[PDB]
Design a protein around this ligand. Structure first.
Ligand SMILES: *[C@@H]1O[C@H](CO)[C@@H](O[C@@H]2O[C@H](CO)[C@@H](O[C@@H]3O[C@H](CO[C@H]4O[C@H](CO)[C@@H](O)[C@H](O[C@H]5O[C@H](CO)[C@@H](O)[C@H](O)[C@@H]5O)[C@@H]4O)[C@@H](O)[C@H](O[C@H]4O[C@H](CO)[C@@H](O)[C@H](O)[C@@H]4O[C@H]4O[C@H](CO)[C@@H](O)[C@H](O)[C@@H]4O[C@H]4O[C@H](CO)[C@@H](O)[C@H](O)[C@@H]4O)[C@@H]3O)[C@H](O)[C@H]2NC(C)=O)[C@H](O)[C@H]1NC(C)=O
Ligand SMILES: *[C@@H]1O[C@H](CO)[C@@H](O[C@@H]2O[C@H](CO)[C@@H](O[C@@H]3O[C@H](CO[C@H]4O[C@H](CO)[C@@H](O)[C@H](O[C@H]5O[C@H](CO)[C@@H](O)[C@H](O)[C@@H]5O)[C@@H]4O)[C@@H](O)[C@H](O[C@H]4O[C@H](CO)[C@@H](O)[C@H](O)[C@@H]4O[C@H]4O[C@H](CO)[C@@H](O)[C@H](O)[C@@H]4O[C@H]4O[C@H](CO)[C@@H](O)[C@H](O)[C@@H]4O)[C@@H]3O)[C@H](O)[C@H]2NC(C)=O)[C@H](O)[C@H]1NC(C)=O
Ligand SMILES: *[C@@H]1O[C@H](CO)[C@@H](O[C@@H]2O[C@H](CO)[C@@H](O[C@@H]3O[C@H](CO[C@H]4O[C@H](CO)[C@@H](O)[C@H](O[C@H]5O[C@H](CO)[C@@H](O)[C@H](O)[C@@H]5O)[C@@H]4O)[C@@H](O)[C@H](O[C@H]4O[C@H](CO)[C@@H](O)[C@H](O)[C@@H]4O[C@H]4O[C@H](CO)[C@@H](O)[C@H](O)[C@@H]4O[C@H]4O[C@H](CO)[C@@H](O)[C@H](O)[C@@H]4O)[C@@H]3O)[C@H](O)[C@H]2NC(C)=O)[C@H](O)[C@H]1NC(C)=O
Ligand SMILES: *[C@@H]1O[C@H](CO)[C@@H](O[C@@H]2O[C@H](CO)[C@@H](O[C@@H]3O[C@H](CO[C@H]4O[C@H](CO)[C@@H](O)[C@H](O[C@H]5O[C@H](CO)[C@@H](O)[C@H](O)[C@@H]5O)[C@@H]4O)[C@@H](O)[C@H](O[C@H]4O[C@H](CO)[C@@H](O)[C@H](O)[C@@H]4O[C@H]4O[C@H](CO)[C@@H](O)[C@H](O)[C@@H]4O[C@H]4O[C@H](CO)[C@@H](O)[C@H](O)[C@@H]4O)[C@@H]3O)[C@H](O)[C@H]2NC(C)=O)[C@H](O)[C@H]1NC(C)=O
Ligand SMILES: CC(=O)N[C@@H]1[C@@H](O)[C@@H](F)[C@](F)(C(=O)O)O[C@H]1C[C@H](O)CO
Ligand SMILES: CC(=O)N[C@@H]1[C@@H](O)[C@@H](F)[C@](F)(C(=O)O)O[C@H]1C[C@H](O)CO
Ligand SMILES: CC(=O)N[C@@H]1[C@@H](O)[C@@H](F)[C@](F)(C(=O)O)O[C@H]1C[C@H](O)CO
Ligand SMILES: CC(=O)N[C@@H]1[C@@H](O)[C@@H](F)[C@](F)(C(=O)O)O[C@H]1C[C@H](O)CO
Ligand SMILES: CC(=O)N[C@@H]1[C@@H](O)[C@@H](F)C(C(=O)O)=[O+][C@H]1C[C@H](O)CO
Ligand SMILES: [Ca+2]
Ligand SMILES: [Ca+2]
Ligand SMILES: [Ca+2]
Ligand SMILES: [Ca+2]
Lengths: 388, 388, 388, 388
């Protein structure tokens, strides 16, 4: 009925409780589960759902052969009920394409899918399940966006896009949408040197995005957006607790306004919640591959170039595969504060498990507790050998 | 609540963006997907859906053997959520039969299915999911209709039917329905010499249908209908850019009031949007078979017998199978103009791929953009060899 | 909102048009379709659905072995969307048991299932999807009811039950329900000598049921019920056009108040519409087995012991299996009269096709037209050999 | 709209009628049915549903190997339509974990899942499908709860938890929730010496729970809770009709305030309805294993240490497997009294049927009748050999 406004601050994060888990690959071993990757979670005022890019085949289907590839005509943004698997029979298609974002503004949902060949991609912006706006590639090199939910304030839903090189300077733009229409866009500003796959959350009328510097940075760039003034800035997380992957070993002092060097041309989508002493960072446990996942409480990580962990929680053991992770919150829960949440994509199959011809994932997701809860670990749980 | 009125003109068509794609044959390789053909798309005020004639079997089922045949007791008009595949578990049956049309008048949906043996077929007209009117065969030779959506204006939904020869003069009638009841019908008038499978759209209180002259014409007949006066006329697209299939090579000058010769007794359902300089024609790229699909901007194609393309867009490469194509619009979108849309049926299996015993299709669909968007191609994507 | 009242007469029946067909056995060859038998159709004010007794297994499942048996703990009344098949994933369970009826009174649905061993069965009467009343066996011999929809008038929904011998005198009772509670019951009166499986319809405040005399009659008993006075009478169809199965050949004169002899201890559920000159009878074409199905217009069949057909329609060829048939109408359609409808169960498998270990059916259903429509035939369409 | 209040007494229980049965294992032999255990039933004001702990795999799936284990990261509370099976495509996930309860307070549903390793488990309390409260393990030994529905009165929904030894003293707490928040909790009081898996029901503003003393008792402990004062007491069922399993043979005199000895360190979840002369107890027929199930009318069982059966009903024969059983009622049915209901879990597979590698169940459920209804027995019905 009214546009949602970001009027609350973050709740105190003292631990993470289990929120949703779909066990998709385990169940998909013998049921009609779509192959996916690049999942996320997003809430409407009455329902929270799982989202992902389908590969337009089931995991047991012969067409799963080749699904390591990221961009094909057979991909689509799909959504499905929380903690169910993305099946053929219960998945709703939001739009067609191989890069996406989606968010509800309090009245209805905007969803964005990019499709096309590398040199001629375009974004279609859907609002209230109708296409409204289209945006053509500006740099003719894989126009691409967040792969997790956007955030809205009073109708204004900013979205970060990047078009251009994955291994050198690219052209990043912030579009400010309302009802699916472009109110304004700006080129990237501040000191972030490369931006991909922003993970965003909203509190007290401000939107914070933690992104992936694929080119040089093992610290993560951060964009902070004012959705009333429609202006932004960017920097890196200052902390020596480095949160991309792959990455070098943690130093004692990080970098605020430049990429922390050591790994070039690679990375993973990730997120953080940056809120003074209430600051938690996600990362893979391995510095080498997408294995393991932990949350670390790192007070003032954004602004303190020597901040180190004061607390932590294991999400996925380093003997289990992880993948993309990102932020969402239920902006429509009752209560005085917004409860931080996140998901981790648990990638199975290629390239690490190459006895199968497919790549897919399942999802685990947690939200914060003000309790100090006991931890478990949350692996995908499938036995690859069953698929041989 | 009120009947919809065609009060808008067409938006400017500067390119086509991806709208929906179900990847049915790829997914159907290992999931319970119904065999179909003759698909289309149609919008209600709150939802747009895929439609097709089911063959009353799954593609992996042994009963798919023989589904090259067009008319059996096991066919039905089914609909299903946009870009999902037509599965056993998510397909809604509209009515029983082997030829159909369907359209929403703003209050509720009329759907029409024809069934019966060739010499004794009948149409049942459903309105608000109840049968209301029945129409018996008048020429005792395969009573048949549009195979794509009809259009309504103030409750009046005209529908084109043909009964009689596919290879000689036949009896074409235009019925004017309201709430499922016959207000009036007229025999075909104007200069179109044979009519099948009209693809219709509505703008500024007028309904334009592009049809298939199966008997002699490689140019397409056009019926223009006034749904207030309930009168119509017909002619052919004047343009030398010939849009049936199979067809001869394009000439320099077309024919306005007669079939353009060169191919007899064959054709394919197709469509155009005819709007002065804003005129786009669809066709197969091959002149010989249902391969490839392109959109061509052909200014004043309807009225200019020498008009040639000023712009174009590839939809399906000539190394991929196409099939039937037709028009629909979301008459209930917000905004100042109606956004032209279309689908292309991507036929797989027999007769061209005869190593399988079945015939089926999947669907791709696009709508117009006022941007000049980059193009991709959109094949079915299934590997027939997986089905061997 | 209000109880429905039977305030209309029957429409003129000049032919039958196709209404619904689920092709369940064809589709069930390779999808998760439940084994059923004893199907029917029943309308709510907003929706008409298919109903049947499930056998609590799929047709391809190993537990379909043995489903020739009528009464087990694994049966339930299920319903599902019109013309879809009864699948595991789309079938709604109404209640548990192996004999049923169901009807909507304009406010909500009453459904009745009987379960139990032969000597200790009981009916549970559900209303608004809650159990309300229970009725214990009175004759300790397979308490059983209509296997097709009941009819309501001003809240009053009479239902016919029989308890006792299938091959001799039994105890038949008519219960008058309102909101699931017993207002009254009466023992069978009039001249019908044995009653099973009544097929009912309602017009002008009167409910007519055509039933099965399993003991002696090849003519069908008829119960006429006044749902305001809650009284009834019974007789047989007088016509020599005999409509049970198996049966002797048709005579020239039938019997009004006694069973027409020639076949003992056997029969099939069937129906008629008895409305003066507007009278149509259903029967199997074979006098020997459940093969073929036709509708015959037999003016004054109920009251004229020499009435013969003046018109007819083939529904199922005598080279195709039929089965149970029964009546329903959409009491909530718009218009001045009620449109007669019926279904025919198309039984496949045992005992006639004993190369499979299962028994199941699919459904075909038609409603009357005031047109003289062309006829087709409507077989199940499955190839038993595919199931070997 | 308003919180439900327990304002009715129990209806007179003269027998039990069949309520729901899903036949899950029979159907699951060839369809995508999830492996479960620990099922129950719970009503909302408009719908009653089946609930269970999923094992995050189908029964035919290779991941069903190992599902004898109770606690894994792949378990979740799921619900699904009454008498349908828990399939991949129709099961709704309530929350993630391996121990649960759920109840509707008249406005919305509270659901509670516990997850974690044995020494660090936590409960998450969901209300209106959002997480609201979290409770950390207090005794670091498998925090666990009812495995059947809780009961609410005026918003207050008490829940029994136990943390600590299964074979010695443990710490049992009663939490009083409202809108998902903790109003109060108390440590267990009264004379019950060990509490697990309480089966609860509500009448005349009082909640009665029959539980499992795993440590020493073959009589069942009972907790009676006042949800207005938020206080409780506990004792055992006094009756010599002993209702745990395994158990010694029935004596002539039971124990009111102590465990009846004979079996240590084992038991099964069960229930009773304790209402003076209207008192019925459930138990397994075997004293040795979870085989058979009967209901016994035992007047004043709670308070009379010599009470013996005056009536009974067989639910499951002693030649069929049973399992957990528990109580629920439809608090929103019309009428002057609440109708007692219960379910029995029918466990199949390991450890008793060890030719399969899985453990699963199906469900049967009954409600009371004021009639003296004939009895049937209600086995799972699957043939284990089909799964070999
Ligand atoms: C039941 O559940 C409980 C709740 O989960 C669980 O208790 C939790 O236990 C976990 C696991 O131990 C704790 O997480 C750790 O937290 C560490 C920080 O806390 C320490 O440091 C603080 C600041 O000085 C102290 O305040 C704090 O003390 C207080 O709390 C204590 C409770 O544990 C209590 O006993 C104390 O007396 C006191 O009150 C405490 O001493 C955190 O540092 C640690 O993370 C590091 O270690 C992990 C390896 O285990 C790494 O995976 C992680 O990445 C961090 O180390 C890496 O990075 C650092 C920063 O750069 C580097 O310095 C390190 O060298 C290391 O770097 C290497 O590895 C990297 C990752 O691979 C790589 O990138 C680098 O390049 C390099 O190779 C962990 O998060 C959690 O906080 C506890 N929670 C609570 C509320 O207590 C309990 O155990 C369970 N109970 C049972 C019975 O099972
Ligand atoms: C990224 O995305 C971009 C957007 O899609 C894409 O750019 C697009 O490129 C396509 C593919 O080239 C363009 O489509 C073509 O459009 C042609 C018409 O445009 C020409 O002619 C105009 C009129 O004289 C000129 O105004 C126009 O110039 C302007 O625009 C230019 C941009 O391309 C610019 O460079 C110019 O300087 C200027 O500003 C331009 O010169 C259209 O004619 C063509 O269709 C024909 O060709 C296809 C074969 O390629 C056939 O499949 C098609 O059927 C048409 O040819 C057939 O039919 C004609 C009519 O009868 C016959 O004359 C021909 O002989 C031929 O007939 C044979 O074949 C038939 C079909 O099989 C058969 O039936 C016959 O019997 C016979 O055998 C095509 O549609 C598109 O317009 C561009 N869109 C835009 C906005 O620019 C860009 O390339 C992508 N970028 C990258 C980097 O990949
Ligand atoms: C396109 O669609 C059209 C619409 O469906 C279709 O036309 C229809 O054609 C069917 C099939 O022929 C017609 O059904 C038949 O109707 C017969 C009754 O009509 C006749 O009798 C009337 C009364 O005297 C005449 O008024 C009537 O004449 C009028 O209409 C004519 C149109 O056909 C027109 O030409 C005339 O000039 C005139 O205006 C007409 O003469 C009906 O009797 C018949 O049923 C019997 O026959 C079937 C065998 O074909 C049996 O299966 C059926 O059971 C009936 O016969 C059995 O039972 C009788 C009663 O006891 C016995 O007397 C018989 O001996 C026989 O009994 C044996 O078999 C039993 C069943 O197995 C068994 O139980 C017994 O023991 C014994 O063994 C049939 O229903 C239909 O009415 C036409 N509809 C219309 C509107 O015209 C048209 O053909 C299709 N067009 C094309 C081009 O394909
Ligand atoms: C059609 O449907 C009808 C409705 O279901 C069905 O009739 C029902 O029949 C069942 C099965 O017989 C009845 O259930 C039994 O009820 C017994 C109690 O009723 C008796 O005792 C009363 C009190 O003295 C008498 O009032 C009562 O008489 C009245 O009713 C009669 C109707 O049957 C009528 O004929 C009379 O004239 C009169 O009006 C009647 O005499 C109940 O005791 C019995 O339960 C015990 O027996 C079962 C074994 O069959 C055990 O499984 C069960 O556990 C109970 O025995 C065990 O426990 C007792 C208590 O400790 C011990 O004393 C026993 O020794 C025994 O203990 C062993 O076994 C235990 C379990 O394994 C073990 O734990 C122990 O350690 C030890 O090893 C049973 O519930 C039902 O009440 C009838 N219902 C009605 C309304 O009539 C009818 O038969 C069907 N009709 C047809 C035609 O099929
Ligand atoms: C899931 C998994 O086995 N992760 C291990 C981790 O347990 C660990 F052994 C590791 F060496 C690592 O990268 O930390 O190697 C991973 C595999 C490797 O980095 C890419 O092949
Ligand atoms: C899909 C496909 O292969 N189309 C080719 C086109 O690529 C092309 F090669 C063609 F020759 C054509 O008709 O244009 O032949 C088609 C096949 C043929 O016309 C019928 O067999
Ligand atoms: C379906 C079918 O084949 N019906 C034929 C009918 O075509 C016919 F040949 C018949 F002889 C008949 O009963 O009319 O026999 C049926 C089979 C038989 O009565 C029982 O086996
Ligand atoms: C289902 C079943 O066979 N139950 C029988 C009962 O029929 C019975 F024979 C029994 F001995 C019993 O425990 O009563 O043994 C059960 C199996 C045993 O207790 C554990 O293996
Ligand atoms: C939480 C848990 O492990 N519950 C299991 C249950 O899954 C189930 F497996 C079970 C059982 O079947 O007996 O026992 C309980 C635990 C007992 O109550 C002893 O404390
Ligand atoms: Ca990087
Ligand atoms: Ca032609
Ligand atoms: Ca008979
Ligand atoms: Ca015990």
């Amino acid at each position: 009925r009214d546009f949602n406004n970001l009027t609350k601050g973050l709740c105190t994060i003292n631990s993470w409780h289990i929120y949703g888990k779909d066990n998709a690959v385990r169940i998909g071993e013998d049921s009609d589960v779509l192959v996916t990757r690049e999942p996320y979670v997003s809430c409407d005022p009455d329902e929270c759902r799982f989202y992902a890019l389908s590969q337009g085949t089931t995991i047991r289907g012969k067409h799963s052969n080749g699904t390591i590839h990221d961009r094909s005509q057979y991909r689509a943004l799909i959504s499905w009920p929380l903690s169910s698997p993305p099946t053929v029979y219960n998945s709703r298609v939001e739009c067609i394409g191989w890069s996406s974002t989606s968010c509800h503004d309090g009245k209805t949902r905007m969803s964005i899918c990019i499709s096309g060949p590398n040199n001629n991609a375009s974004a279609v912006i859907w609002y209230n399940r109708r296409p409204v706006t289209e945006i053509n590639t500006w740099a003719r090199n894989i126009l691409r966006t967040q792969e997790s939910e956007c955030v809205c304030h009073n109708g204004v839903c900013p979205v970060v896009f990047t078009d251009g090189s994955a291994t050198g300077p690219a052209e990043t733009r912030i579009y400010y949408f309302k009802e699916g229409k472009i109110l304004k866009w700006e080129p990237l500003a501040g000191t972030a040197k490369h931006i991909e796959e922003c993970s965003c959350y909203g509190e007290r009328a401000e939107i914070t995005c933690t992104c992936r510097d694929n080119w040089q940075g093992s610290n993560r760039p951060v964009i902070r957006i004012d959705p009333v003034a429609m202006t932004h800035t960017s920097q890196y997380i200052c902390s020596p607790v480095l949160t991309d992957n792959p990455r070098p070993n943690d130093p004692t002092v990080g970098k605020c306004n430049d990429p922390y060097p050591g790994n070039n041309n690679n990375g993973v989508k990730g997120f953080s919640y940056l809120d003074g002493v209430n600051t938690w960072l996600g990362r893979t446990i391995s510095i080498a591959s997408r294995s393991g996942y932990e949350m670390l409480k790192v007070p003032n990580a954004l602004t303190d170039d020597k901040s180190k962990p004061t607390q932590g929680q294991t999400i996925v053991l380093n003997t289990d595969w992880s993948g993309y992770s990102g932020s969402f919150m239920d902006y429509w829960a009752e209560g005085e504060c917004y409860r931080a949440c996140f998901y981790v994509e648990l990638i199975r199959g290629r390239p690490k498990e190459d006895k199968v011809w497919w790549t897919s994932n399942s999802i685990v997701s947690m939200c914060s507790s003000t309790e100090f809860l006991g931890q478990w670990d949350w692996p995908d749980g499938a036995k690859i050998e069953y698929f041989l």
